[PDB]
Every structure is written in C-alpha cells, then in structure tokens.
Design an enzyme around this catalytic site. Structure first.
Site, PDB file in Angstrom:
ATOM      1  CG  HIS A  22     101.398  62.583   2.317  1.00  0.00           C
ATOM      2  ND1 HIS A  22     100.667  62.125   1.241  1.00  0.00           N
ATOM      3  CD2 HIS A  22     101.145  63.910   2.405  1.00  0.00           C
ATOM      4  CE1 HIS A  22      99.986  63.125   0.715  1.00  0.00           C
ATOM      5  NE2 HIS A  22     100.269  64.225   1.390  1.00  0.00           N
ATOM      6  CE1 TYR A  31     103.310  65.949  -5.224  1.00  0.00           C
ATOM      7  CE2 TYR A  31     103.179  64.533  -3.289  1.00  0.00           C
ATOM      8  CZ  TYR A  31     102.639  65.511  -4.098  1.00  0.00           C
ATOM      9  OH  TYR A  31     101.422  66.059  -3.769  1.00  0.00           O
ATOM     10  CG  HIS A  52      97.264  65.871   4.531  1.00  0.00           C
ATOM     11  ND1 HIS A  52      97.148  67.208   4.244  1.00  0.00           N
ATOM     12  CD2 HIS A  52      98.045  65.336   3.564  1.00  0.00           C
ATOM     13  CE1 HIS A  52      97.827  67.477   3.137  1.00  0.00           C
ATOM     14  NE2 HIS A  52      98.376  66.355   2.704  1.00  0.00           N
ATOM     15  CD  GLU A  93     102.537  67.051   1.986  1.00  0.00           C
ATOM     16  OE1 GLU A  93     101.433  66.955   1.405  1.00  0.00           O
ATOM     17  OE2 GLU A  93     103.627  66.817   1.424  1.00  0.00           O
TER      18      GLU A  93
HETATM   19 CO   LIG Z   1      99.585  66.203   0.958  1.00  0.00          CO
END
Ligand SMILES: [Co+2]
EC number: 3.1.21.-
Length: 248
Positions: A124, A205, A122, A114
C-alpha cells in the site's frame, strides 16, 4: 509514552485530513514458456546507488521495528524480497515526483507491505501534497505502473529471453500491477479517483494490522511500514497500536 510514539501520533494528527491518493503495488504469478515467475522471483539486487540506499533503509527499518521479546521466523528469502520491493516501490514514486518537478519534502507519503489472504504480498502507498490534485490520479497510476513494470523486469531473477522479458513487461502493465483506489462503479461506467485522508487511514486502519512473524505469513498481516517523516518506520507492533489509541 515514548517520544517516538508521541512524535508519530502528533505527526499523523497534524495530517489527519490531508487528501492523498491510495495505490497498491503488487505482482501476480506468471508462467512463460514453462518458466514459473512467482511473487518472489525478483531478487536481483541492482547496483544503482539510490536503490541500494533505499534497500538499506528497508533493512534497518525491519531491524529497528523487530520485537525481540518474541521470536521471529519469517523466511529470509521473504524478508529479502520485501526489502527489494520496498526500494523498487519507492524508486517508482520518486521517478514520478521527478517528472512533475515535485520537491520530495513537499510530499506526504506512507508505505506498508502486507500479505493478503488471496493475493499474497502487496504494498500500500498513500501519497499526496500541495502539488497533487484528484484529477491527476489516473495519470499517476499509469506512470507508476510504467516504472513498476520496468523495474520488475530488471529485478527479475529468472533467466528470461528478450521476448519473455517484453511479455512480462506487458503483462505487468496490461493487468495493472499498480492499482488506484476509486469509488465503486459499474464496468461500463466511469471510474473516479477516491482520495483518502492520510492520518486517519494510517491511525485507524494500517496501524491496526497484525505483524507477520512466521512463514507462511498470517493472512492480512503487515511486514514493514515507512513514511515521509520516518515516524512510523521503527515502531514495534505494540507501539503502533499505542499510536492508534492516542490518536483517538
Ligand atoms: Co492490504
């Protein structure tokens, strides 16, 4: 309702409630003796067979998830660096799995690159399985940050002295360039690892994010995702939102 979309939805739903760790792999801007080391200063392609394989996987994931109905003007350098980071992040995960003698097929994981409004690039990582328990979270973060810092210093394309490489290595560790999700807490107080629910977090999400298709990247957008079942890898943005819709 393609098989790919149905297959991904079913796979995530079966893992809706599986507890996993949540990590973020990142970097921060560094200046060492006037030398600028930015987020995309790690573009050496290291000739280790496994890393090469992983980087090819990221490229192909990007290629297959690209929507060609709409144009895409992401900078080539940006794509290159994200592909390299995908391979390095995964190398770190697999090195720690090896330490614990965990068969990779017994692991559920999900990776998503992202671009944050403030922090920029970064990655996840959700990861867990039968061989994982909450009390091991802090150890995992520390070990991951060891390998992440080691690989970043190896991949760095800025000409560095040995003293500068060691400084960069210690910066990446001391400043925790791998973070672990914890419950909110006070500075003095203990932090407790906060496991998340794998399928729910992905469907509700991560799959709701908007795809980056420009440079500079849209704040909060995603570049690339992958998982241990190769289920979400090749999904286009519209397909990912369809998965979310069906998951409910
Ligand atoms: Co993020």
């Amino acid at each position: 309702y393609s098989d790919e979309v149905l297959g991904a939805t079913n796979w995530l739903k079966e893992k809706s409630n599986q507890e996993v760790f949540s990590f973020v792999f990142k970097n921060e801007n560094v200046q060492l003796n006037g030398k600028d080391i930015g987020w995309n200063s790690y573009k050496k392609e290291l000739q280790e067979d496994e890393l090469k394989s992983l980087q090819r996987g990221a490229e192909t994931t990007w290629d297959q998830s690209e929507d060609m109905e709409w144009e895409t003007t992401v900078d080539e350098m940006t794509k290159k660096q994200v592909f390299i980071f995908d391979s390095l992040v995964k190398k770190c995960l697999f090195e720690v799995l090896n330490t614990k003698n965990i068969f990779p097929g017994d692991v559920n994981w999900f990776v998503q690159h992202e671009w944050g409004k403030d922090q920029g690039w970064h990655c996840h990582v959700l990861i867990g399985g039968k061989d994982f328990s909450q009390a091991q979270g802090k150890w995992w973060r520390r070990q991951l940050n060891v390998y992440w810092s080691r690989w970043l210093v190896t991949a760095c394309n800025v000409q560095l002295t040995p003293a500068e490489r060691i400084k960069l290595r210690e910066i990446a560790e001391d400043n925790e360039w791998v973070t672990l999700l914890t419950y909110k807490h006070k500075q003095t107080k203990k932090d407790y690892t906060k496991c998340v629910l794998f399928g729910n977090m992905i469907a509700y999400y991560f799959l709701t994010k908007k795809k980056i298709s420009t440079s500079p990247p849209r704040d909060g957008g995603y570049f690339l995702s992958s998982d241990s079942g190769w289920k979400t890898n090749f999904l286009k943005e519209g397909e990912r939102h369809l998965v979310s819709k069906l998951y409910t």
